[PDB]
Symmetry: C3
Subunit: 56 residues, 3 copies
């Protein structure tokens, strides 16, 4: 019965990794979009930032 | 012998899954707050930033 | 032979799972802190600038 249990556990752990992989992929994809958005904001503001702090 | 080892691996997976669920939940919640904050900021700069 | 072999392989898979994720978790905390710092600088610059130069934007 033990070998049966461990055989099944293999597929269960595989299922878990597949779930995890997708949840992570989605988190990272969103993280990626926030960075892109943030970077556009920083680029847009760069001239204003420099106007406040950097001569010439 | 092997029964106790397998039991211990079941518990490890259990703990790991639980750590994952809770920790990813805390990261997703913080990510939402960052999105909200970024959306406010962008609202100030529209429609200029989009153009 | 079959049983012991599965137990051995399973031990290794579970170790790998736990290590992989300790590593992913470290990258997240790092990228999230950096994102927060960047956003915070933007916010801290933009509020007083709006207030003093571009006031109707609010
Ligand atoms: Zn100025
Ligand atoms: Zn091990």
């Amino acid at each position: 019965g033990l070998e049966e249990k461990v055989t099944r556990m293999e597929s269960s752990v595989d299922l878990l990794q597949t779930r995890f992989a997708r949840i992570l992929a989605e988190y990272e994809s969103m993280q990626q979009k926030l960075k892109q958005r943030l970077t556009k904001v920083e680029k847009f503001l760069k001239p204003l930032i420099d106007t406040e702090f950097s001569a010439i």
